[PDB]
Ligand code: HEM
């Protein structure tokens with residue numbers, strides 16, 4: 001297996017065959033990188049947690065040797081042409097960047113947000129129940145607009161702007177035209193920049209306001225840093241969630257017995273959302289690291305300066321922790337999944353995500369119980385060649401009845 005990673009996700013109900021055969025060989029294997037390099041590939045679940053929690057495996061893209069797995073040469077160069085992202089800093093510097101935002105995702109904080117989320121979901125579910133289309137693309141009706149608007153709600157954009165925020169955000173993930181996206185971000189970075197300025201003078205009940213207040217009361221303002229935060233949040237939480245919604249439906253639909261459980265008792269939904277996250281693990285290899293020291297792990301001696309890639313999808317399908325990992329079992333209480341990562345960088349909005357999905361799945365199947373795929377499974381175009389797994393478009397329908 002001189003194989004060169006990454007390997008495309010060809011089947012949405014089983015990870016690349018090569019992945020399993022790699023784990024069967026060892027918890028950690030040195031692999032070939034299509035990008036040209038070479039790096040360590042962690043397939044074992046225990047080792048996955050190990051590295052992701054071990055600070056010796058840096059996430060700083062400013063370091064020579066950082067793996068070009070999910071990164072371009074140009075993408076790496078861009079990151080080295082601006083301040084580091086939270087997703088790219090270590091220890092103290094990281095902590096300092098995360099502490100001031102941890103509060104925006106507490107149980108209480110997110111609790112007050114719930115209603116706003118429900119309303120957004122209900123709205124689009126409505127728009128669906130009134131479409132003049134035979135088949136409807138669940139991706140453009142639900143998947144995309146929901147996470148984006150939920151986030152702008154969080155940041156604090158006025159309701160009177162949802163349409164704008166929805167169109168630019170949606171285009172920033174456009175499939176065609178590298179310029180449309182560029183033009184999308186552009187118009188947004190402008191909106192957000194001024195929106196914040198407005199907030200500085202007469203705030204409200206949003207993240208922006210609360211942030212501007214802390215910086216003032218604490219040390220001093222950082223307009224750019226705040227503008228940067230907004231995008232970090234939108235960026236790391238829009239497509240991931242969207243794709244999770246898409247795959248969540250397809251997964252639930254392709255497993256009736258499981259869908260009935262969720263549809264029968266909504267209290268079982270939260271645990272179902274966890275199984276769905278493990279099952280698909282759409283962030284698979286975004287957890288690339290750069291060893292800054294020599295480390296003995298997984299029975300392998302990793303030398304400093306070498307790249308380390310943690311495969312979350314591989315860890316979440318590790319049979320040594322998840323009995324029959326190949327089966328979609330909403331019932332299993334198997335905690336410890338890594339779809340959200342592990343360690344210092346574990347997903348900051350993992351709970352906002354859990355909330356969205358939970359609300360989306362319940363509402364969707366409660367309001368449109370007979371929802372089914374408008375086309376055969378093999379026809380649904382999955383984003384199997386994308387860094388973050390998902391589905392390009394998902395045609396669907398339901399039964400319009402009479403009494
Ligand atoms: C919906 C599915 C989502 C998945 C699967 C997901 C997954 C992840 C993963 C795996 C990481 C760690 C990456 C690494 O360590 O290199 C991460 C980080 C992060 N995610 Fe998400 N995420 C999701 C949604 C969100 C949402 C909704 C937000 C909030 C807007 C969010 C905010 C973040 C932030 C800020 C980080 C960086 C944390 C840090 O640097 O310490 N994520 N996410």
Ligand SMILES: [Fe+3]
Nearest residue numbers: 400401402403
């Ligand atoms: Fe009726």
